[PDB]
Task: inverse folding
């Protein structure tokens, strides 16, 4: 049908049909009389999987023969979403599979909707890992993602009476056709025990053993026949575990709970023992696998020439002392040599500066669970502080600030300090964030070792986030500038030559309108809600957190409602305001924010005077597959975190690539997006980082804003008095009290500029031609935000390897 | 190579090779450079599985179209063993697969040894269910086996310092290629709650729900292209289960524990709540599936014309009140009509008379777990006793003896009484056992309803238990009388015409000698033990239980040792005495018996005066795959239970078919085996049932035997004084005390006759020609003990269906 989806040749279509029928019969054990739609989905998935396996085997053989430096990306989260369509895109099979299934009397889009998201992450951090795997394969790097195969991923969100309810995400219930269990590479992981000191050195003895069983998932690159591996570990009890008899077998569940469930926190450190076990489990299994692969080509001097380990925040920070443990205790390297190898092998990426997100583990927990690792950490600390003291003699407060060990009621280990000490490179994830690291939280470390500190601005894969989710846009671009941009996104700059082309302007606007109609129809069918598709689609989708300021958006929505009620017969640009995202189950204020959004919706959506001029919709169960539907349909992207809090953001980039304009603060990657597009093509408002600092020095007093802004005062009175909760008048008192007295994120301070800026958005939307010209200027300058650019920078500047766009043979 | 293994045609061999390579590449994702032997096993299993699926689909379609009466065999145990070789035998693929694998450079026998036993039973009861499934498919019955998919089957037995240690049987660790998950037929099962009485009738409300997910395994018939289904249920928590958040997800394990592990008891009722949950789980899921299939062809009058439910002991006895519950509470049938349907649908097979094996559930457990079922049981009881009182007016003691409710400190439900009341047929499993049922434990029931009571003597499948495990014997038989006997075992009678044929005598003896050499070599390789293969192989393999009298065998072994020590330079027929079997983990005396056997071995096997004249070997981890190796190698089969205790036995039959002579009591099916072969061709000894009864009336006094038999007294003194446990002199005091004062199974009473009978065995073994002639007379008359004969009798006399040997089209 459309060119970017590839060729549907007669021989390919015939072969796919015959393999589809083969899998239906032999793999699924069904015929066409009893087959369900889910059976047809599986028959297609197995058919497509067959095209991966030859390439997967050949890729891994190629790495064995050439022995390149291997890159190991360690993460507690990989937010993969669905695999079927992405695999077809990367193998150039989409049109052929569409035709094959069409000839069999089936609709491939319907079959795609049956697949479960692999929801093994919380949001941006986990999704970044997934984009990165795609880019590493597309750039021909010998890369492996290592994580945990959680039985239950991020919870499914239901809304009941306007409140979030959680249910378990039993994503493996029907099977996962993409993974391959590799029980033969099962490895032991040790916990508890104690340390014995012999004449041979230290020995970690009397431990409890849990087995780590790997499951491998293929990661195809874009049309280059490279298929890399994501290896995820699952916890298994040994067969003699606890071995009355029946209880001993039932108690195997205690060991196997390590891989049972993803902790559903975003930017919040809980400090639970089970989480620490997960972190060690992934590190310990991964490092043994790394060392095994290294030996199967004594001389650990070459280890950093053959191995790079990238730590995705501090969650796998135990890799540093575990590598030391293996090299010193088991391989018998001297301490100094082991440390040289460790530092040259490891690099650390920081993804947040929020104090509540930083991992600080109590010493008593580490002492019980990982006694040898605690000894190694103390020795690392003593040697590190010896260097600090030599560089800054007499600066005793610096020694306490830089220590890996924090004093207090409970002593804790600061895992970020450990990562900096044991890594040859430390990076932030957007220019402003990397600068904040050097100026504030890691200032002392930057002064000791300035050469370590780098920036690597985040990116997104244009395969999933343009070609897959928005084929109509991909196609109209390809008609003008060809297909090369899909693996070289900088080529989108060529679209600046079409900003005054009437045909291109029309086509850009038509694709958006089609995506809006398709999304409006999705909302009616799956959720029985009716929206005006000629309205401006104003979208804020991301996890619910005070720093992301969904509350500021709520204040604007109420403002627009109150303005309509005051002058009902005045024209206003119609909007559909859509907010979605999950709250962590223990985060009370986040749950109250969800309830506020649905309560505003209950009033606004049923007021006959408003009509279809304003609708407020809470999008339930926001996840990767829903992002693929709503992002292409958006007109306005809300990126409104308090300056200095969103380390980068990546949703911002997805919206830019898909033809939405951005309203946002000068935070994270928003700064660089505005720089690339031109500030005149971005709706920038609010305090800069420097203005937030100036308010903090004087002291933030929310009452001042309340006193001076009548429109704001009206909203707070409506919230307090029960206007949005008539049956429960005090329902929102916690929200009002927080805004008025304890607001760390200064919602009222940006209210006036935000509302004024929103008025400018409305003004531009009334001139469709000029709106669309501005959109073109955004799409055309989005090239920098390809994760292919990001990964090429990590490769050259951190890992010491050269990317390649060359194809392996088919 | 050998004819009974089928044809190896060039086209078949070529096709198997190409599919093997296809599965290695696409299914397993390996090439020949990295493939392990386990990978080759899986590639072969998938290749053979492909030949089943066309037949499986066609068989189930055929039943849908013809709508025959369906037979549902309900069991808590299916002791299947390995599937690969059995599948090849039943599809006539064995020689073709041997050739195909040979051409690929692989040894198929080595690959067969990689497969795990499906150990989902304890012993005879579970294995009988497996033989029965094979016979039902071979006889073309529309039959389904329904059970539980235990995650952990019967434990793996290790012997450490002569003691049994248990380890978990993690049989699913590498995957099971034979099963197919059917998550689409998942059904809810209810527990706890309470009963509400409305004007519409009773309602069971406020229940906890567990989901039952079915896994289907194909059951191929012998060369008839019929493939039936074994459906096993696995427990799953619903997604809203317990829905802080993390603990709620972890606590899903409480529901899922229902299918976690097989209770490892043989003939011993423990009475644990988890076991009751297992029993209801299997019944409730199965009955819904049955009713669904019945409706998918209001009128339950035809239900018993389309459905038969066979209850394998009382373990699924809750099927009776569950069927009543569904018909009365949900379908709104009147009680009397529902009862008529239930009785005509259900039939009960009893497999034991031991008092400690009979299920008697406390009322307080049923009241909490299954409150509606308890109400229905009480109503069944009241109506049943009303009939008893009308038939035997004034007989108040009969009313108390026959009640389903037993009075006492704790009130209990007698599940056997429930099964008799609610079934149209009740059978025992050997003639003597069925007679015991009518004369003793069910005498009252027999007097009320004599027409209900039947016999169905047990059998074994000649596919697994001759063709598969002893191809050399199958072949030499086929050379004389053709292949038809494999599905018509009565044809073995034709071998009586060869009892004086010198060539046949030679061949029978040669096959035994080959099997003995092969087994002697297996023992050296896997267990580092050396045996004389010219010795008489004296074998007792079965679960360890006081009633089976492994202790009587021990007394004979010590007797032979003491006789050698007394006259070292006298000739004695050399023996290798092999004893194997598992003890239930909580059964202390059974564990002590294992320790005694290994302790006797420690003395006997290292005495230089004995030499290779006597060896005592404990065969570790006895299970179906070990039975297939040792049974063909045996000369003497030990079947020495106290008369009246072994309901049938089936190991006895396996040994008879494979060319061993039997030493045994007139117990269970031993009576019928002796009748078929002629008493002159059997080594019968000991008390008959009537003699045991006479001793019980006078009172058993073990001291009398001790006082009168010097050889017995010497053994007891050796045990007591520490001769077999020099480091721990009192180790065996519990055994001595039991034998002398509390022996329910009268070991000393059969000692003299047993030893004398063993002397006659030795005498015959010295004349190989006459030994072999007697063997031929046993093999030739073993036809009655085919499970095909057993199943044909159930079909005609209980289920009301006609067996068929006709082939479905290929
Ligand atoms: O469960 C926990 O203990 C825990 C603790 C901290 C956590 C921090 C994060 C986390 N830190 N930074 C992040 C996000 O990472 C993205 C990719 O670079 C950034 O675009 C985004 O601005 C940032 O908020 N997520 C996620 C889960 C966590 C879970
Ligand atoms: O775990 C329990 O509660 C429990 C209770 C009773 C049990 C009884 C048996 C059981 N009863 N009879 C049997 C065996 O069934 C075979 C097939 O008909 C007979 O050949 C054999 O003589 C008999 O002992 N096993 C098995 C497991 C049990 C488990
Ligand atoms: C991209 C993405 C995120 C991150 O969005 P931000 O606006 O950068 O927080 C979160 N969740 C999902 C499902 C995503 O696809
Ligand atoms: C046949 C068999 C049994 C039953 O043997 P009996 O001697 O009848 O108790 C027990 N276990 C296994 C593994 C079997 O094959």
Result:
């Amino acid at each position: 049908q459309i060119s970017v989806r590839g060729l549907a040749g007669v021989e390919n279509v015939t072969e796919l049909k015959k393999n589809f029928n083969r899998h239906l019969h032999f793999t699924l054990v069904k015929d066409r009389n009893v087959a369900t739609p889910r059976d047809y989905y599986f028959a297609l998935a197995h058919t497509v999987r067959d095209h991966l396996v030859g390439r997967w085997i050949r890729t891994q053989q190629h790495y064995y023969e050439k022995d390149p430096k291997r890159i190991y990306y360690l993460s507690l989260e990989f937010y993969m979403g669905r695999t079927l369509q992405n695999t077809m895109v990367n193998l150039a099979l989409e049109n052929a599979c569409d035709e094959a299934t069409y000839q069999l009397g089936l609709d491939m889009e319907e079959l795609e909707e049956i697949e479960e998201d692999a929801g093994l992450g919380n949001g941006g951090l986990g999704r970044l890992a997934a984009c990165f795997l795609d880019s590493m394969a597309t750039l021909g790097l010998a890369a492996y993602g290592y994580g945990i195969r959680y039985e239950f991923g991020i919870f499914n969100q239901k809304i009941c009476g306007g409140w979030q309810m959680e249910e378990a995400d039993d994503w493996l219930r029907y099977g996962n056709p993409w993974e391959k269990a590799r029980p033969e590479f099962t490895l032991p992981v040790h916990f508890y025990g104690r340390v014995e000191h012999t004449s041979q050195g230290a020995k970690w003895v009397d431990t409890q053993v849990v087995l780590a069983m790997p499951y491998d998932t293929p990661v195809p690159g874009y049309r280059n026949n490279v298929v890399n591996t994501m290896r995820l570990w699952s916890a298994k009890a040994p067969n003699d575990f606890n071995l009355g008899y029946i209880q001993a077998v039932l108690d195997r569940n205690l060991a196997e709970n390590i891989s049972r469930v993803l902790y559903p926190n975003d930017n919040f450190f809980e400090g639970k023992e089970l989480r620490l076990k997960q972190e060690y489990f992934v590190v310990a299994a991964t490092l043994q696998d790394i060392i095994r692969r290294f030996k199967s080509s004594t001389n650990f001097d070459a280890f950093p020439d053959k191995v790079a380990i990238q730590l995705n925040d501090t969650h796998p920070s135990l890799a540093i002392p575990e590598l030391m443990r293996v090299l010193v205790d088991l391989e018998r390297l001297d301490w100094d040599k082991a440390w040289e190898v460790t530092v040259k092998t490891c690099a650390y990426t920081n993804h947040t500066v929020l104090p509540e997100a930083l991992e600080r583990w109590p010493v008593h927990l580490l002492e019980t669970l990982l006694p040898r690792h605690l000894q190694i950490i103390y020795e690392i600390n003593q040697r590190f502080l010896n260097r600090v003291a030599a560089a800054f003699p007499g600066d005793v407060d610096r020694l306490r600030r830089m220590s890996l060990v924090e004093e207090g009621a409970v002593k804790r280990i600061n895992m970020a300090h450990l990562c900096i000490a044991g890594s040859h490179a430390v990076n932030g994830v957007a220019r402003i964030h990397s600068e904040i690291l050097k100026k504030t939280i890691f200032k002392d470390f930057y002064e000791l070792e300035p050469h370590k500190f780098q920036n690597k601005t985040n990116g997104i894969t244009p395969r999933r986030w343009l070609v897959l989710c928005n084929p109509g846009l991909a196609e109209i671009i390809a008609e003008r500038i060809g297909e090369e941009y899909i693996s070289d996104l900088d080529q989108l700059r060529k679209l600046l030559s079409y900003v005054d082309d009437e045909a291109f302007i029309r086509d850009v606007a038509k694709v958006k309108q089609e995506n809006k109609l398709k999304f409006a129809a999705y909302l009616e069918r799956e959720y029985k809600v009716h929206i005006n598709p000629n309205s401006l689609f104003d979208v804020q989708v991301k996890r619910i957190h005070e720093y992301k300021r969904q509350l500021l958006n709520c204040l604007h929505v109420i403002t627009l409602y109150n303005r309509i009620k005051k002058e009902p017969n005045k024209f206003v640009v119609p909007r559909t305001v859509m907010i979605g995202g999950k709250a962590a189950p223990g985060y009370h204020m986040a749950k109250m924010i969800i309830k506020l959004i649905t309560a505003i919706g209950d009033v606004v959506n049923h007021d006959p005077v408003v009509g279809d001029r304003l609708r407020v919709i809470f999008l339930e169960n926001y996840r990767v597959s829903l992002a693929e539907k709503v992002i292409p349909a958006a007109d306005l992207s809300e990126q409104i975190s308090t300056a200095g809090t969103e380390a980068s953001g990546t949703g911002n980039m997805k919206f830019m690539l898909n033809g939405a304009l951005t309203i946002g603060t000068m935070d994270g990657a928003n700064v660089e997006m505005a720089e690339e597009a031109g500030e005149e093509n971005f709706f920038i408002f609010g305090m800069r980082v420097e203005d937030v600092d100036r308010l903090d020095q004087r002291g933030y007093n929310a009452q001042e804003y309340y006193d001076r802004i009548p429109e704001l005062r009206q909203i707070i009175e409506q919230l307090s008095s029960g206007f949005f909760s008539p049956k429960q008048p005090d329902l929102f008192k916690d929200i009002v009290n927080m805004l008025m007295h304890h607001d760390r994120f200064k919602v009222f301070a940006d209210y006036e500029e935000y509302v004024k800026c929103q008025e400018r958005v409305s003004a531009l939307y009334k001139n469709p031609r000029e709106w669309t010209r501005m959109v073109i200027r955004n799409i055309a300058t989005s090239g920098k935000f390809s994760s292919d650019r990001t990964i090429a920078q990590y490769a050259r500047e951190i890992w010491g390897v050269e990317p390649s766009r060359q194809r392996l043979p088919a």
About this structure: The longest strand of chain A covers residues 208-220.
